[PDB]
Symmetry: C5
Subunit: 311 residues, 5 copies
């Protein structure tokens, strides 16, 4: 078994297609996702051509070892895919129709800049290395590219599964390589984040701001310092589901900003008490009254600036 | 080895059966469950027929490679099942009786809307792709569908294991596909949730309401703020065992509602103190006395509304 | 290769034996344990009989594929065992002596009712399905059932490894099945639980009871509320190592009872303060003095009732 | 392929040798370690002897299937080792020189009594079961026992890798078994424990003792109760990296002792307050002044007693 | 199949090359990284020489089993690599051009002394053991050493992937071994650490220093003790992502130093209160005023000393 020889000196076109059966385990920290799909391959092998009238059979079924099959691999995989050959069909002209069902863990990077209001473009890169006798080029058979309706990815909305029809043909270690880009467009379901993380986080922050309606330093210390512990808990809970990014994220910016607001609240609480002890509560009262308006206003304006910069 | 030819142009019926031996590892967050079961297959292959008289044997045993066996796969699996062929028996008329024992991780989504008082319908989808020569259709042999009495799923009550007898026959990549729906009905054992989560959660909430029988702002701050830390702990403990849902859950609604009640309690504690400092405790006392009745009543009524909406 | 034919119409007896080499990874939450052992099988195959005088050999060694070997499987396993055939020996009468070394993850449920003073009976179920030509029945060769001296299961004391000699012979999917019960008796090492969990838990509970020797509401609130946070930490630490049970456990009952005692302590602390503020400390003093005796007495009596109900 | 027959009656000596290439993943909780090493085997097979003159080759290379190779297994492994045969060489006299490269997870118990100032003796048990025709005995070829210089075990110092030259020959299921003990001596690197765990733990304990220089019950309660929460955190952090032992550990005793010191400190704080409320601060002052000396002295003496009992 | 014989007593040179396709999962605690790459091998085997005129092909393709292939292994791997042979090409002279695509978990130690501002030199060691008949030596084909542009390692910047061209030829167990060092230079992306860990950690430390502007012992105790709980949380969060090192790390030194600063702050808070109770606030005021300047100055100077010692 060797590659089919060229009629003239044209490269061998292998038509490809991926049909998603299952999409699961999207690990944000690891930037990986598991996929279970059909991989369809089609090429012309004139050595396998037959007469349909004399053979009496329209199609001829073959075992993988019986014929030449192109070595198609995935670029962005952890380990080589687990494949099960479903069917091999040969038409009278020698056109081969290969079909396998595979499962693979795909390495595809994510952009956390807009998290949890982010959309991602997941990639599946198909590749073929050219042999010495002839060069192999990949193609997209749009009729064999898709996903089943039941394909669900927990916490995500699946937009589209398409392929960039033009392959990236490049030289690697003195041989030609034909690469195809299969793109899975997904957008994060941000609903849950509001009553589970966003609203409870704002509530604990508003609790610290009740210290602006109190002169009791011991109670104010308790209010601001204790809610800071809850803020630290929410910060840790959020950052454990996210990887360390070399760029600032929308959530990252907000979290950092809340740390500043807590620090400024501690300063206010310290200043108010110092002036009270220094027998000048009229100065303390004016600062505290200003803080009641300043803190929510500056917080609301800063969040508008952040939302604008990130979206 | 190729599929058995048709007598007349009828499709090939493959009778199926699944008998559950072991049911384990129901991962709520991952929405997966592990299953160890018997898979029985039966089809007529006239090429394998024999005369029981001249053969001297009523049945003929074959090795998988010796005969044609239909390529049956599972739709909603992570990876292809781990199968061990138990027995292959051929009757004189050519009826084949296949039996294998498999283990597989099944991807089946869960509805957490009523958690932890929820019931689930787990699915196992059997499938067969039609070949060139003839079309393969699946069937349910009710006599070979079941589960053993010992089959236990930790934290769940197993109701029934049945199959939808009518297959979903559809075209996929220019070939016919026959799909069967095996349904495992289960209901969650909610007992443990009451003394472990529900009752302790209500106790910490009632402790915060003792601030309505105190005028001591420092003590009230301590009571409401510290019990909030415990509520955050319980919130985190519960949400780690649940996936992020694009819908509101019964538990989710309650958790969120408790965050509102804590926020309103902080407001009351802030108001009571402000009026006390403003030398008007008669106003503070009337608000605090009203809160003693209002807080449990509104909490009890809101929970009735939530139980009604979710159930 | 087919099963040995019967002399007269008796079933085929396969003598079994399991000898434990390694016992490890007892997962309480998962209710599973890993086992590495020898599996010995013995049956009579008269087709393999030979004369020892003319053959000059007392024993004949065979490869697995050369002869018929019964398909023995485990019922309560996650996946099919990882076996390595050690030896196959045939005696002159045709008695086959099979030996393999296997490793398997066993699914065996645990009774947490008396945890951590619980004992468990772990099970390993051996099974054989009867073939069409003849029926296969399992037996226990007591001389080939055991465990090595070094077999250690971390945090457990291994009592005995025995087998119920009488097999459970039953019909399943119109064929006979012979099941054997191998029982591994173990008891939990409860030593560590006393200085690590029990005594520190009682200490934090006793710290809350020091509030019955104080009139300072702010200090009492701090004492009872802060130790409740520690009580929650211990509750979470314990329940993470245990699965969700549909029955009440000994530890579960105690944990729940401590939550009641904390709630009653908050009520006492609230009542004592209210009466003091209401300018009647004589009533508060009598309640507080009674609580000093009542709380440890009721706690000690309730624990006696719980220990009696559970043991 | 069968074992080499004896010249006289003597057993077959298989010379063994393990050369460690990689040592990693020492799991304390699981009491396991991963090893990647060379396994060398040598035995005389006279059936393979050749004349170096007639053959023209001083050595003969064989494939595993071509010749008889003894079935050598590891006793204390989770699953059977993953082996790759490197070389098989036969000398003219028939001496076979086998070499394989393996990887295996080894089950070896640890003694936590002196943790984190503990040393361990890890074990690798080589074994061979005697066949029907002749008995196989293991031996140690000291020239082929070693480890490479780069072999590093994270958080441990590797002392020596030696083997007990005399095998443990015993009967198991009526056949002889020859066992060899390969010992890997390691000692824990306790450096990190001092500035990371020990010193910070003493600091939080000393902070609780500052309550002996204060008469403020509310501040004292805060000091002793809050540092207890930190002590609980450190207790949990330490015990999660350790398995549940049926014996007391050095660390375990200290941890338990600190819980006693916290309880006694709460008693002192309770007593001091009661006497001051009872209008007798002279009694309270004498107890508090004594506690300032008593607490560090009794703590220092008790630790000397513990270090003496454990080392 | 045996090694190619020498023309003139020279060793067999195997030209090697590694081309990285995917780099992922750099586990700091485990000191391992996963790699998916191309492994190219080239050696002369004159026994495979052919005349393209007689064979009708300029290059011959072979299956791995058909010809002799050198046994190349990796030194610092957990388990043997998962390899898929891509192509084997033989030119008329008998020069073999082998290509495989492998995936492997590599054991490479890291130096955490400068963490999180550290750079690492990851290693991949290629090795070949010499056979009886002739000695095998490794070489680096620089044209076949590289990495693709998309190769991304989460949280790291990939500097270079080069190989030490001169192999380390040494004797091991009576046979020659040729080792090659493939070096992957990486540097940690320290950006995220500043707003996520560094700045929030400094904020909680500055909050404790507000106790130097207060005379309220109860408030000061709350400020210093509560922020210590947050400092413990940050310490635990950081040390869980790092292994236990026998050397002091830059982060380790800082963490330890913060524990000292908290202890000294508790001493100051204790001293200030004692003098105030001893009716000498003039002494307490002078210490507290000095602490306001001393604490940030000594902290800033000590950090300069630490940064200097570590960088
Ligand atoms: C403390 C901060 C609170 C969070 C505030 C909400 C943040 C926000 O502005 O989210 C916007 C987001 C919609 O994202 P998209 O519209 O999908 O982003 C693409 C936008 N373009 C192409 C124009 C650049 O999602 C929404 O539509 C917002 C709905 C959630 C409202 C939450 C209220 C608390
Ligand atoms: C943490 C805050 C919890 C406070 C509320 C406590 C009561 C509680 O939650 O549980 C009620 C729940 C039963 O309600 P559901 O059966 O789940 O209602 C279904 C709605 N339909 C069927 C009409 C579509 O479950 C039960 O089994 C009720 C018994 C609970 C007993 C404990 C005291 C609540
Ligand atoms: C706050 C609660 C503290 C716990 C109190 C101890 C609980 C207790 O009584 O445990 C009993 C247990 C022995 O169990 P077993 O004897 O193994 O159970 C079999 C019992 N029968 C007779 C029915 C067949 O174990 C013992 O022997 C008890 C040893 C532990 C003592 C701990 C003291 C703090
Ligand atoms: C609160 C408890 C504080 C900890 C006190 C230190 C514990 C201690 O004494 O450790 C001793 C240990 C050395 O152990 P080894 O010498 O390795 O054990 C063998 C001992 N023989 C053979 C003689 C019986 O290690 C040492 O050499 C001591 C180094 C640690 C110093 C810690 C200072 C805080
Ligand atoms: C409480 C402690 C605060 C942390 C202080 C910052 C630590 C620091 O100085 O980090 C230096 C680091 C750059 O290191 P490198 O230049 O990459 O290391 C090589 C240096 N030589 C070869 C000269 C020895 O990284 C930087 O360039 C520093 C950027 C981070 C600034 C953080 C401000 C909060
Ligand atoms: C009578 C005062 C009613 C106050 C109601 C508070 C409204 C908060 C709205 C939050 C929306 C999410 C602020 C808290 C303010 C506490 C109230 C001060 C007491 C004044 C007594 C006179 C947080 C924002
Ligand atoms: C004599 C007062 C007895 C009060 C008993 C409290 C009953 C709580 C029932 C909870 C059911 C679950 C509320 C707590 C009320 C504390 C009691 C106030 C002290 C009044 C002193 C006069 C929580 C509901
Ligand atoms: C001088 C009084 C000494 C009291 C010693 C407390 C004994 C606790 C026994 C625990 C057994 C384990 C109780 C706490 C008791 C606090 C001490 C009250 C001080 C009264 C001063 C007069 C806990 C039960
Ligand atoms: C001027 C007093 C200086 C006190 C210095 C404390 C030394 C602690 C040494 C710890 C060694 C590790 C104790 C804390 C003592 C606090 C100091 C009491 C204030 C007295 C005011 C007069 C903990 C041991
Ligand atoms: C009018 C006083 C303004 C104080 C501003 C504080 C600036 C902190 C800069 C941190 C940089 C990162 C210190 C906190 C000092 C609190 C302010 C004392 C109140 C004095 C009242 C007169 C922490 C450094
Ligand atoms: C408390 C924060 C409320 C702010 C809500 C902003 C929602 C923006 C939606 C923009 C859709 C394009
Ligand atoms: C005061 C800081 C407490 C931080 C607690 C974080 C809890 C994280 C749990 C994450 C489980 C997935
Ligand atoms: C306010 C601090 C809340 C911390 C809660 C931590 C809960 C972690 C649960 C982990 C279970 C796996
Ligand atoms: C159909 C069964 C409904 C049972 C409802 C029980 C509700 C109990 C609420 C108690 C709240 C503390
Ligand atoms: C502090 C609680 C002490 C209770 C000890 C009970 C021990 C029961 C032993 C029963 C053995 C049969
Ligand atoms: C008073 C604050 C208590 C915070 C305890 C947090 C515990 C976090 C556990 C996280 C386990 C991963
Ligand atoms: C209210 C604070 C509760 C803290 C819970 C700590 C749980 C730690 C679990 C650690 C599991 C390894
Ligand atoms: C703060 C505790 C310091 C105790 C140090 C003990 C060091 C013992 C060294 C023993 C070497 C054999
Ligand atoms: C009361 C505070 C308990 C804190 C327990 C913290 C547990 C941390 C475990 C982290 C494992 C990675
Ligand atoms: C608050 C700490 C600020 C210190 C920043 C130091 C940055 C040093 C940069 C050195 C680059 C070589
Ligand atoms: C009282 C201090 C509690 C500190 C707990 C820190 C928990 C960190 C958990 C991080 C899990 C990735
Ligand atoms: Cl692949
Ligand atoms: Cl499948
Ligand atoms: Cl099995
Ligand atoms: Cl082994
Ligand atoms: Cl013996
Ligand atoms: Cl023997
Ligand atoms: Cl390798
Ligand atoms: Na092929
Ligand atoms: Na077949
Ligand atoms: Na067989
Ligand atoms: Na307080
Ligand atoms: Na062999
Ligand atoms: Na080869």
């Amino acid at each position: 078994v060797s590659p089919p020889p060229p009629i003239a000196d044209e490269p061998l076109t292998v038509n490809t297609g991926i049909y998603l059966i299952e999409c699961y385990s999207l690990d944000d920290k690891a930037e990986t996702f598991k996929v279970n799909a059909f991989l369809s391959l089609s090429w012309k092998d004139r050595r396998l051509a037959f007469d349909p009238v004399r053979s009496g059979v329209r199609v001829k079924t073959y075992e993988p070892e019986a014929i030449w099959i192109p070595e198609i691999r995935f670029v962005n995989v952890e380990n080589a895919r687990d494949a099960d050959v479903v069917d091999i069909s040969v038409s009278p002209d020698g056109t081969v129709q290969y079909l396998e069902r595979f499962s693979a863990r795909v390495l595809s990077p994510l952009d956390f800049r807009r998290y949890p209001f982010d959309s991602q473009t997941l990639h599946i890169y198909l590749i073929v290395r050219s042999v010495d006798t002839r060069n192999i080029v990949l193609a997209v058979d749009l009729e064999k590219v898709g996903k089943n309706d039941d394909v669900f990815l927990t916490g995500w909305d699946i937009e589209s599964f398409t392929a960039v029809v033009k392959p990236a043909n490049f030289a690697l270690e003195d041989r030609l390589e034909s690469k195809l880009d299969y793109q899975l467009r997904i957008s994060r379901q941000y609903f849950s984040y509001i009553p589970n993380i966003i609203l409870p986080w704002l509530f604990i922050l508003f609790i610290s701001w009740t210290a602006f309606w109190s002169t009791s330093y011991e109670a104010n210390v308790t209010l601001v310092v204790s809610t800071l512990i809850a803020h630290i808990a929410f910060n840790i809970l959020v950052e454990t589901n996210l990887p360390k990014t070399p760029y600032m994220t929308y959530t990252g910016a907000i979290i950092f900003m809340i740390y500043l607001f807590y620090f400024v609240a501690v300063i206010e609480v310290t200043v108010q008490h110092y002036l009270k002890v220094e027998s000048q509560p009229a100065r303390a009262a004016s600062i505290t009254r200003a803080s009641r308006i300043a803190f929510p206003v500056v917080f609301l304006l800063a969040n508008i600036i952040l939302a604008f910069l990130f979206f």
